[PDB]
């Protein structure tokens, strides 16, 4: 019951978008896809599109996992934003490019008192027009829970590696 999609699929969507917010996570680090990600970033910025990064406090597997890797790829500090300072922007955003992030976006933190992820504040990726979701499979994140977002009309699953998928998305663009 899941809307899948290819790299060319996701290329059309972000090219025809006024505002993108990249939501990097642990998968982005594993694939080492941060140089490829900031490439996709400044091809979008070159054509005029508004790009920013939404960093969850506990993205990756350590404090500042996302920061150091984005810093390696020379994404400037002014584009990178913390949860509390960027959650409102999702409303005014056509696309939430969720690269290798799962638990960080999961709305079960506020719709499932029984779930262990409950209580933790999350990134409201659902408030954006549509949501891209790069991950190799349908496997759960660290916390081992199904994502409600995974299957619903405003979401699309780009199945594969985060570096190869994002490199394939830059090629589909110009």
């Amino acid at each position: 019951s899941v809307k899948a999609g290819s790299a060319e699929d996701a290329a059309f969507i972000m090219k025809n978008a006024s505002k993108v917010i990249i939501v990097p996570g642990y998968g982005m680090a594993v694939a080492q896809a941060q140089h490829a990600l900031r490439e996709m970033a400044d091809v979008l910025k070159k054509e005029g599109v508004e790009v920013s990064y939404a960093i969850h406090p506990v993205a990756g597997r350590m404090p500042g996992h996302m920061n150091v890797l984005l810093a390696e790829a020379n994404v400037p500090y002014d584009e990178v934003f913390e949860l509390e300072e960027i959650n409102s922007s999702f409303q005014t955003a056509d696309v939430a490019f969720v690269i290798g992030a799962n638990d960080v976006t999961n709305p079960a933190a506020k719709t499932d008192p029984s779930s262990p992820i409950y209580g933790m504040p999350i990134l409201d990726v659902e408030k954006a027009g549509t949501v891209l979701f790069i991950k190799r499979s349908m496997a759960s994140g660290y916390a081992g829970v199904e994502n409600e977002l995974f299957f619903r009309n405003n979401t699309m699953m780009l199945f594969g590696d985060a570096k190869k998928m994002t490199e394939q998305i830059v090629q589909a663009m110009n």
């Binding site: 150091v68 890797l69 209580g119």
Partner: protein, 379 residues
């Protein structure tokens, strides 16, 4: 409803359990935030800055804690047995919140119980995503791992990065990180961004991926054994002496080329596993260093000594204590944010009191004594 934050009396402890940001949020929740003078001078949080945020600067430790319903400090209170009765200064029936190390320090728990204080051992915070904002282990370990690289670079006589120059080339340093928890992961990060070649090793299966995700190479040992090496909250087990042997032999190939070795390995309750023996430091080349973040609980290398930089066999074995304090000005505002996130949900809104929900998984697992009786199962 008074909440007081004293100065940390323990030697070599420049941190404080407060920041201006947290004082603003506290008084806004309905508190009167008191704080002893000079409390955060070692953390660059001046007396003036605290009163600006909305705090009363008390003169002595006694005056601050005398009429306080809540106390926040970083390290456990001192007892009369240790020469200074800090627990005596705490109001009867009050609420303490600090890093007690309650499991290893039974005396301080009995002293807090004789005064009917409700103590919350902040290190017993359950490992869940809901309570990672309340977790002092992570915030302080993370900075300690950064520090280890800064300290290794300091004592080391070559530069971390590779350099190509008119006068020739110098190779990068080679770092080996033993133990890849919160601390070791930030060490792999800090070394790797400084341009060093970074190897690392651990006993938990899900670590290999994590090391690679920062850009270091992993040293496997027994991929059929690391499978059952994790426990309840992600902690590691003991592995006997048949693994202690098997680790040192595969590691040895890389340890001989290692310039800086950072050891973070530590088992909860039990002392530290020996990962670098004296026999192994003989085979290390002169000019090397070992940063031992596990020194305060056995040490991963027996040669290391608390608070000293011992030098044996050509190797500067560094072994500072209280490493997060070596980053006190960043470490403190985090520590205070942990304390705040733990306390905020339990402030009764329309009344300005506090009630700690018993069924709250975060309260049950962290409470050590309450109303003059030891509560924690394991005590």
């Amino acid at each position: 409803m008074k909440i007081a934050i004293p100065k940390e009396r323990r030697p070599g402890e420049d941190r404080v359990a407060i920041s201006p940001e947290v004082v603003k949020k506290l008084v806004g929740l309905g508190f009167e935030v008191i704080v002893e003078q000079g409390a955060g001078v070692g953390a660059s949080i001046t007396d003036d800055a605290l009163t600006a945020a909305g705090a009363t600067i008390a003169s002595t430790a006694a005056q601050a804690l005398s009429q306080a319903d809540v106390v926040w400090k970083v390290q456990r209170p001192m007892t009369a047995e240790e020469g200074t009765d800090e627990v005596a200064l705490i109001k009867e029936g009050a609420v303490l919140m600090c890093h007690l190390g309650a499991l290893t320090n039974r005396p301080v728990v009995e002293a807090l119980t004789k005064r009917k204080i409700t103590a919350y051992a902040m290190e017993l915070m359950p490992r869940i995503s809901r309570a990672q904002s309340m977790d002092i282990l992570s915030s302080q370990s993370n900075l300690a791992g950064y520090r280890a690289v800064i300290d290794g670079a300091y004592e080391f006589a070559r530069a971390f990065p590779m350099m190509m120059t008119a006068a020739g080339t110098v190779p990068p340093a080679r770092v080996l990180v033993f133990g890849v928890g919160v601390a070791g992961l930030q060490a792999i990060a800090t070394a790797k961004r400084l341009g060093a070649v970074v190897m690392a090793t651990d006993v938990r299966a899900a670590t290999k991926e994590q090391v690679e995700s920062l850009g270091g190479k992993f040293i496997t040992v027994d991929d059929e054994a690391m499978k059952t090496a994790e426990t309840a909250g992600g902690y590691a087990k003991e592995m006997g002496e048949e693994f202690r042997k098997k680790q040192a032999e595969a590691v040895l190939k890389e340890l001989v080329k290692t310039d800086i070795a950072i050891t973070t390995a530590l088992i909860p309750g039990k002392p530290a596993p020996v990962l670098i023996t004296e026999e192994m430091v003989t085979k290390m080349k002169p000019g090397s260093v070992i940063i031992d973040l596990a020194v305060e609980a056995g040490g991963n290398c027996p040669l290391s000594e608390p608070g000293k930089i011992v030098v044996k066999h050509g190797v500067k074995i560094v072994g500072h204590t209280n490493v997060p304090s070596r980053v006190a000005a960043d470490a403190s505002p985090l520590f205070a944010k942990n304390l705040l996130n733990f306390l905020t949900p339990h402030v009764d809104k329309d009344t300005k009191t506090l009630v700690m929900k018993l069924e709250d998984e975060t309260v049950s697992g962290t409470c050590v004594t309450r109303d003059g009786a030891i509560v924690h199962p394991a005590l």
